[PDB]
Design an enzyme around this catalytic site. Structure first.
Site, PDB file in Angstrom:
ATOM      1  N   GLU A 157       4.515  -3.073  -2.720  1.00 13.26           N
ATOM      2  CA  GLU A 157       3.121  -3.325  -3.054  1.00 13.26           C
ATOM      3  C   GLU A 157       2.725  -2.579  -4.319  1.00 13.26           C
ATOM      4  O   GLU A 157       3.070  -1.408  -4.492  1.00 13.26           O
ATOM      5  CB  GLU A 157       2.217  -2.918  -1.888  1.00 13.26           C
ATOM      6  CG  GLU A 157       0.734  -3.202  -2.100  1.00 13.26           C
ATOM      7  CD  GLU A 157      -0.129  -2.833  -0.894  1.00 13.26           C
ATOM      8  OE1 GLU A 157       0.423  -2.340   0.113  1.00 13.26           O
ATOM      9  OE2 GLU A 157      -1.367  -2.997  -0.969  1.00 13.26           O
ATOM     10  N   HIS A 191      -4.627   4.222  -5.168  1.00 10.59           N
ATOM     11  CA  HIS A 191      -5.376   3.662  -4.057  1.00 10.59           C
ATOM     12  C   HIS A 191      -6.850   3.623  -4.416  1.00 10.59           C
ATOM     13  O   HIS A 191      -7.390   4.581  -4.971  1.00 10.59           O
ATOM     14  CB  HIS A 191      -5.154   4.472  -2.787  1.00 10.59           C
ATOM     15  CG  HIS A 191      -5.696   3.812  -1.558  1.00 10.59           C
ATOM     16  ND1 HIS A 191      -5.947   4.500  -0.391  1.00 10.59           N
ATOM     17  CD2 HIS A 191      -6.053   2.528  -1.324  1.00 10.59           C
ATOM     18  CE1 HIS A 191      -6.424   3.665   0.515  1.00 10.59           C
ATOM     19  NE2 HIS A 191      -6.500   2.462  -0.026  1.00 10.59           N
ATOM     20  N   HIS A 247       3.770  -0.975   2.817  1.00 10.23           N
ATOM     21  CA  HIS A 247       2.333  -1.075   2.590  1.00 10.23           C
ATOM     22  C   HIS A 247       1.870   0.048   1.674  1.00 10.23           C
ATOM     23  O   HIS A 247       1.917   1.222   2.055  1.00 10.23           O
ATOM     24  CB  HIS A 247       1.572  -1.016   3.906  1.00 10.23           C
ATOM     25  CG  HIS A 247       0.136  -0.634   3.746  1.00 10.23           C
ATOM     26  ND1 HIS A 247      -0.304   0.668   3.851  1.00 10.23           N
ATOM     27  CD2 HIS A 247      -0.960  -1.382   3.485  1.00 10.23           C
ATOM     28  CE1 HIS A 247      -1.610   0.703   3.668  1.00 10.23           C
ATOM     29  NE2 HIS A 247      -2.033  -0.527   3.445  1.00 10.23           N
ATOM     30  N   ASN A 248       1.383  -0.323   0.491  1.00 13.85           N
ATOM     31  CA  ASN A 248       0.905   0.624  -0.512  1.00 13.85           C
ATOM     32  C   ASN A 248       1.899   1.769  -0.674  1.00 13.85           C
ATOM     33  O   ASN A 248       1.618   2.934  -0.400  1.00 13.85           O
ATOM     34  CB  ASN A 248      -0.498   1.120  -0.163  1.00 13.85           C
ATOM     35  CG  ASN A 248      -1.543   0.032  -0.304  1.00 13.85           C
ATOM     36  OD1 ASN A 248      -2.038  -0.501   0.685  1.00 13.85           O
ATOM     37  ND2 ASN A 248      -1.885  -0.300  -1.541  1.00 13.85           N
ATOM     38  N   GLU A 297      -1.850  -6.597  -5.653  1.00 16.65           N
ATOM     39  CA  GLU A 297      -3.270  -6.605  -5.334  1.00 16.65           C
ATOM     40  C   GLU A 297      -3.967  -6.342  -6.663  1.00 16.65           C
ATOM     41  O   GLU A 297      -4.404  -5.228  -6.947  1.00 16.65           O
ATOM     42  CB  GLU A 297      -3.624  -5.569  -4.276  1.00 16.65           C
ATOM     43  CG  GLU A 297      -5.062  -5.650  -3.793  1.00 16.65           C
ATOM     44  CD  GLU A 297      -5.341  -4.729  -2.621  1.00 16.65           C
ATOM     45  OE1 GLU A 297      -4.413  -4.019  -2.183  1.00 16.65           O
ATOM     46  OE2 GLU A 297      -6.493  -4.716  -2.137  1.00 16.65           O
ATOM     47  N   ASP A 347      -0.932  -1.980  -6.232  1.00 24.04           N
ATOM     48  CA  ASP A 347      -2.374  -2.170  -6.326  1.00 24.04           C
ATOM     49  C   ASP A 347      -2.831  -1.709  -7.708  1.00 24.04           C
ATOM     50  O   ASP A 347      -3.406  -0.639  -7.888  1.00 24.04           O
ATOM     51  CB  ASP A 347      -3.078  -1.414  -5.209  1.00 24.04           C
ATOM     52  CG  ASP A 347      -2.831  -2.028  -3.850  1.00 24.04           C
ATOM     53  OD1 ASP A 347      -2.011  -2.962  -3.768  1.00 24.04           O
ATOM     54  OD2 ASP A 347      -3.431  -1.564  -2.859  1.00 24.04           O
TER      55      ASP A 347
END
Lengths: 307, 1062
Positions: free
Chosen positions: B348, B363, B318-319, B397, B350
């Site tokens: 991931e 983030h 996750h991230n 994302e 983003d």
């Protein structure tokens, strides 16, 4: 009047709280005061100091005299065996001179307060048997004062009033010369008007300063010999029973004060040397320092490793 | 390669070469000789050959890469060096891998460098345990002084016991052990130390073997378990393996012989029956080859890779870009590299807007840095399949503009070529393919076009406090008409030899006498004091070569200045000059020629320290502690009537007193940590933690205590507190929460307190103190001020190309919470709250969707602390993309590593068939639950527990079953005191029973904690294993730091018996 500010000695007035006065001269007063933050690294530290200030009816000449006095402390420097200037408050109020404080006062009264029994003129209830000065203590005090005059003469200072009243005792008993650097005019000082009213230390001066007013470091040596006489008389009055008028003929006839009862012969010959008629043959303070250090090393009866 | 060749390779590596060293700390590189050391197995780099400057454990080297592909080579310095010669090595036991970047002088040297480091790595990984024990003892020897010597004295040994986390009991049996080992004259050759070391462990922990033999069992050991060394016989050893350890390959004797030959690794032992000593048998039982972990799962099971992808738990994260907290963490591609090399297979990205156009990653709406995307994808390719060649799933994302997505996808295709998946593997298939079918392929997961073909303020701010009178950078966020902020983001007189007021010459002579006798007895050593007899003179009171004498520092005036002189042979102004010239050059008296060594410090320097009180009773101390609200406050006080001391502090808002005793000149805290000086005590504990995670930051002095009394109100955090934590967006980092409704901000034009841009809170109630946050930028100030101001009052978004690139794992929210009609091409992206709600409500439906559909779960944004959540239940229902944060280390994270170790850390784990059956239900109630396998565990002893801080560990062990609520059982072991290296847990304590309902997924978790002086358990090491991989018998769990990295020689002995229920 106005005073130029010196950042190196200037201390805030509000950080100094005055206390109970200690002694009063003819023109100026000295007080025991507490100075806050004398150590710039320790701004919250309280130090007991002696603060000198003019009287309310003081004249301009006294103000100039104190200005000269603080300046002389500034130029001479710092030394353990002299009273050391700590600073001054010159702006926005009366001229304050902050110097070191001596808790035990001058050495004359300190010595007088330590005289052993049978030697007292009157009974001292404040007699402490644990503080009695041995011969080593007297020789050490003399050594400390001699070191002080060596520092002063190294700075070309002639005390001109060397006396047991004129050296203070710290709480650590460390001798500190007081009243030095006084550029006091020799214009007209009467021989017949007691001190605090203007008597010269006629019982402390050498004949060249007494007759021709020749003040020198050799006059300083003579006065330090007077100091040794007083110390080994335990603050004794120079020339007991000798009138000031007869002092002239006695010194001119070469008369010198007797041997103190509890004083050794070597120190006695040192007093003779300091009281030589010719100033040039009088010993210089450095040699007195070394001789007194040798007497101290012999008296202290402690082993030391000759390197 | 030939072996004669290896000789030159290693010897060359051993001789070393001047090698250009880069690191981020120095812009200019340093020419330093780099050489490998077999004896330490460390590649050390230094200037002088006598002392080695930098350490580098070869084992913790996780990979060697060529070129300049490392964060170090961005100083534009190695550019001069050719690409081929340059390389870098990544190592350590942290998620960020500390790097050593090197630039060579000729290519062939670089190639030989990488080759030798590789080969050394494989041998070290293959190295036998006694050999690595030798290397570790040698490392300790290299540490004790940097002269790389091969000898140790008594004193170095005693100071080394803390290093090995072993306490000397009374220092009198230590000399006895010296006599026994034959070493004499307080000197230690290397092998004497090695034997003494073995003897220490064996005598300490022989009761292990004493229970080992036991009774009612096949004869493994005889009665010769006395400290007397005795041999392990090969036939006896294979009897042991076949019966006690139940090893199938132990049936053959030749295998047993080969194993002894490897483990002992002694060319002297060429006997047809090599024998292990009884103590060597102990070393075996603690050694790696007796791991509880079964080797058979290391070989990635291919036949298990034929199932459709819907039947595999996958390694997903996750991230990942965040090397730390989701907020304010450096993001570097090496995070992705280390992630992939872990064995992750779903990562991931983003991506956000690109400044020049090329997108980046950070983030959202935080201060985590930016790293360019091309580097990211290049690194992905260069480490996609190297450790595991199975398919990877990069999740996007997307947040950038259409042209930036176009460039992103174009870069995808240009750098991936055939590696990327651009066409379905089985077009006519109705299901997810087998992972084998997708080998060496890259899956792109990302929002596609719609069904018809058509689609808060945060920052680091400033805190001014009248109490602290300094500006502290605190992270700040706004939400729900409130603001949250975190913790903070970050010469005679003063010298040791000068001692000022010392009572007497006798006292100083004593003080130097105890100082010499407790350690460091030197000749002519000195002590500077003040003469109580001689005026205005210092005193160099000196010990004399087994004695102590006194001589005053002579003093005379010269040139109007102090002449701190000495017999006229030597005279100086700063005491330093004489002290040094006497240290190197002996002072010469007609008696001797002696120098100076020890400049002992003051007996009570702490006196001059304001934080130190002279005599403070307990009640008044509590009074000042309660008056002071701040946490991080401390004050030390001499306990009345006793030489002992006490330190008082407010933490959690509770006042606490800690008693410190004194042994010799050292001050002892609790019963383990020995600190020379109280100043040293405070200086150390400022940079470390004492209680919980609290550190001694705020001194408590009366001069600051008035300023405390001036202002005594700081708004505070006040499981309701945990509810507030989860409410505020800053989560567990929210130290201070303040309702911004109560304040009417006015922007400070010029600011205040020596800062450029600040603004005024101006609370509604005028008595409330202001806060006055400050920024870095005036525009930032304006943005913040106006923010609080309103607080007081064909295609649409996705570029066509990249959307064409997605072929699997389609993101569909059209079904919303309904799971109906699971299709193989879709993915469900869940957050932990809604995921758990679904699990509680419709678990069977989640299972049914999963066996066809893809389920991706990520933690909420309310966990900005990067704390991993509880995902076990998610696998029990079969969730496929259990994405976590690899940069943390929590119990659940080690559960992740346990699960994903299997199948050769390839990131895929085939779900069991029975759970894939239609009949079986994920969540069974009490009635349906039927005990399936009993598991008896008895831990016995450990080895080489690392050291956290200056305190020597007092260890205990927790063994528990990470799993379901019915599966959750714990066991604590009786803690032992002051025994870190060779601890014995109760030989008398019984075995514990576990009942296992679901063995195919349940975790054995051993952990080791240490009881502090506050009796607070803390994390030492862990070991998490799938119970299917647990072997039986007496096996040594190899211990592992929180970041899933093994620790040298770290191991616990445990007897485990797995009896299936019949």
């Amino acid at each position: 009047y106005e005073l130029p500010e010196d950042p190196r000695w200037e201390l805030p007035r509000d950080r100094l709280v005055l206390g109970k006065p200690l002694g009063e001269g003819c023109f100026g007063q000295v007080v025991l005061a507490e100075a806050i933050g004398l150590d710039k690294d320790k701004p919250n530290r309280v130090t007991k100091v002696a603060v000198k200030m003019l009287k309310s009816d003081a004249t301009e000449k006294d103000l100039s005299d104190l200005i000269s006095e603080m300046e002389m402390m500034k130029m001479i420097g710092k030394h353990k065996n002299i009273i050391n200037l700590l600073g001054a408050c010159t702006q926005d109020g009366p001229l304050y001179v902050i110097v070191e404080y001596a808790s035990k006062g001058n050495l004359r009264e300190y010595l007088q307060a330590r005289r052993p029994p049978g030697l007292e003129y009157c009974y001292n209830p404040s007699h402490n048997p644990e503080e009695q000065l041995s011969s080593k203590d007297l020789v050490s005090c003399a050594y400390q004062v001699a070191r002080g005059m060596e520092y002063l003469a190294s700075k070309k200072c002639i005390h001109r009033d060397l006396a047991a009243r004129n050296v203070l005792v710290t709480e650590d008993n460390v001798m500190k010369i007081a009243d030095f650097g006084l550029a006091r005019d020799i214009h007209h000082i009467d021989y017949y008007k007691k001190t605090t009213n203007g008597r010269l230390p006629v019982k402390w001066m050498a004949p060249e300063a007494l007759f021709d007013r020749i003040y020198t470091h050799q006059s300083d040596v003579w006065s330090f010999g007077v100091l040794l006489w007083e110390i080994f008389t335990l603050g004794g009055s120079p020339y007991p029973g000798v009138p000031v008028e007869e002092l002239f003929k006695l010194l001119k006839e070469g008369h010198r004060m007797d041997k103190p009862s509890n004083c050794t012969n070597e120190l006695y010959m040192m007093m003779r040397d300091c009281w030589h008629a010719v100033p040039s043959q009088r010993p210089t303070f450095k040699q007195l320092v070394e001789d007194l250090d040798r007497i101290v090393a012999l008296t202290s009866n402690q082993e030391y490793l000759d390197l | 390669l030939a072996e004669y060749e290896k000789s030159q390779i290693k010897r060359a590596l051993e001789l070393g070469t001047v090698m250009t060293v880069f690191s981020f700390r120095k812009s200019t590189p340093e020419r330093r000789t780099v050489q490998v050391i077999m004896e330490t197995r460390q590649v050390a780099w230094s200037k002088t050959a006598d002392k080695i400057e930098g350490f580098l454990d070869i084992m913790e080297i996780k990979e060697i890469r060529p070129g300049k592909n490392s964060k170090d080579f961005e100083r534009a310095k190695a550019v001069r060096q050719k690409e081929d010669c340059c390389f870098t090595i990544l190592y350590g036991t942290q998620f960020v891998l500390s790097t050593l970047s090197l630039a060579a002088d000729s290519k062939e040297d670089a190639v030989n460098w990488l080759s030798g480091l590789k080969i050394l790595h494989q041998e070290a990984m293959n190295a036998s345990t006694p050999t690595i024990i030798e290397s570790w003892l040698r490392k300790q020897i290299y540490s004790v002084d940097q002269t790389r010597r091969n000898s140790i004295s008594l004193r170095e040994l005693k100071t080394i016991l803390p290093l090995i986390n072993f306490k000397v009991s009374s220092a009198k049996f230590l000399k006895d052990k010296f006599v026994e080992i034959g070493a004499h004259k307080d000197e230690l050759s290397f092998e004497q130390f090695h034997l003494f070391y073995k003897k220490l462990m064996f005598e300490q922990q022989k009761s292990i073997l004493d229970e080992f033999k036991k009774d009612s069992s096949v004869f493994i050991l005889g009665n010769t378990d006395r400290p007397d060394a005795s041999a392990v016989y090969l036939h006896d050893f294979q009897r042991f393996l076949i019966h006690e350890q139940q090893e199938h390959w132990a049936q053959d004797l030749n295998k047993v012989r080969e194993r002894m030959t490897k483990f002992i690794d002694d060319t002297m032992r060429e006997t047809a029956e090599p024998f292990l000593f009884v103590d060597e048998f102990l070393t075996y039982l603690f050694s790696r080859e007796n791991s509880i972990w079964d080797e058979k799962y290391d070989a990635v099971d291919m036949q298990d890779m034929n199932n459709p992808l819907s039947h595999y738990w996958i390694s997903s994260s996750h991230n990942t870009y965040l090397t730390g907290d989701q907020l304010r963490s450096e993001s570097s591609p090496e995070a992705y590299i280390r992630c992939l090399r872990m064995g992750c297979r779903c990562i991931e990205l983003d991506c956000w807007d690109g400044p020049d156009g090329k997108p980046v990653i950070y983030h959202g709406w935080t201060r985590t840095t930016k790293i360019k995307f091309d580097d990211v994808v290049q690194a992905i390719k260069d480490h996609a399949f190297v450790t595991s060649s199975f398919p990877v799933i990069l999740s996007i994302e997307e947040h950038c503009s259409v042209e930036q997505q176009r460039h992103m996808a174009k870069a995808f295709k240009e750098v991936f070529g055939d590696l990327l998946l651009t066409k379905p593997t089985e077009a006519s298939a109705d299901q997810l393919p087998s992972p084998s079918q997708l080998r060496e392929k890259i899956i792109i997961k990302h929002k596609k076009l719609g069904p018809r073909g058509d689609v808060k303020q945060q920052g680091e701010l400033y805190m001014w406090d009248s109490i602290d009178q300094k500006w502290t950078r605190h992270y700040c966020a706004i939400a729900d008409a409130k603001l949250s902020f975190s913790d903070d983001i970050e010469l005679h007189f003063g010298e040791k030899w000068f001692h000022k007021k010392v009572e007497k010459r006798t006292s100083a002579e004593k003080l130097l006498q105890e100082y010499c006798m407790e350690t460091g007895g030197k000749d002519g050593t000195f002590l500077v004091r003040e003469s109580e007899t001689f005026p205005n003179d210092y005193t160099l009171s000196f010990w004399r070569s087994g004695r102590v004498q006194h001589c005053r520092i002579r003093s005379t005036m010269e040139g109007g200045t102090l002449k701190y002189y000495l017999t006229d042979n030597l005279t100086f102004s700063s005491i330093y000059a004489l002290i040094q010239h006497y240290r190197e050059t002996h002072l010469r008296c007609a008696e001797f020629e002696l120098r100076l060594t020890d400049p002992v410090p003051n007996p009570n320097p702490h006196e001059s320290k304001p934080w130190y009180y002279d005599s403070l009773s307990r009640g008044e101390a509590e009074d000042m502690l309660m008056r002071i609200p701040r946490d991080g406050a401390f004050l030390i006080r001499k306990r009345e009537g006793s030489d002992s001391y006490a330190i008082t502090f407010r933490a959690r808002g509770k006042v606490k007193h800690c008693r410190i005793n004194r042994d010799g000149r050292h001050f002892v805290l609790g019963t383990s940590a020995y600190f020379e000086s109280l100043v040293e005590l405070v200086s150390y504990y400022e940079k470390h933690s004492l209680y919980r995670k609290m550190r001694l930051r705020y001194p408590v002095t009366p001069e600051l205590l008035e300023r405390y009394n001036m202002e005594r109100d700081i708004n505070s955090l006040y499981e309701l507190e945990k509810q507030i934590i989860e409410d505020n967006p800053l989560g567990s980092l929210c130290r201070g929460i303040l309702d911004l409704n109560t304040y009417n901000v006015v922007k400070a034009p010029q600011g205040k307190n020596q800062k450029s841009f600040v603004f005024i809170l101006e609370p509604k109630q005028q008595g409330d103190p202001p806060v006055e946050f400050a920024t870095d930028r005036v525009e930032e100030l304006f943005e913040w001020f106006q923010s609080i101001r309103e607080i007081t009052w064909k295609n649409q978004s996705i570029a066509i190309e990249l959307s064409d690139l997605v072929v699997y794992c389609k993101p569909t929210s059209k079904t919303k919470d309904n799971l109906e009609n699971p299709d193989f091409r879709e993915i469900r992206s869940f957050v932990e709250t809604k995921a758990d709600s679904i699990i509680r409500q419709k678990p069977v439906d989640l299972l049914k969707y999963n066996q066809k559909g893809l389920t991706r779960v990520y933690p909420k944004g309310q966990r900005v602390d990067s704390s991993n959540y509880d995902p076990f239940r998610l696998w029990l229902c079969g969730s496929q993309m259990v994405a976590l944060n690899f940069q943390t280390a929590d119990k659940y994270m080690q559960m992740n590593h346990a699960l994903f170790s299997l199948n050769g850390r390839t990131g895929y784990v085939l779900q069991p068939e029975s759970m894939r059956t239609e009949k079986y239900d994920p969540m069974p109630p009490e009635s349906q639950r039927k005990i399936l396998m009993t598991l008896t565990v008895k831990v016995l002893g450990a080895r080489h527990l690392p050291k956290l801080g200056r305190s020597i560990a007092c260890p205990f062990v927790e063994v528990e079953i990470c799993g379901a609520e019915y599966d959750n059982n714990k066991f604590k072991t009786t803690v032992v005191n002051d025994n870190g290296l060779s601890p014995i847990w109760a030989p008398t304590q019984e075995k514990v029973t576990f009942e296992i309902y679901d063995p195919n997924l349940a975790f054995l978790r051993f952990v080791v904690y240490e009881e502090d002086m506050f009796s607070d358990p803390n994390f030492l090491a862990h070991a998490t294993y799938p119970i299917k991989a647990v072997k039986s018998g007496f096996r040594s769990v190899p211990l592992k730091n929180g970041y899933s990295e093994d620790i040298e020689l770290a191991s616990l002995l445990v007897f485990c018996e797995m009896r299936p229920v019949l």
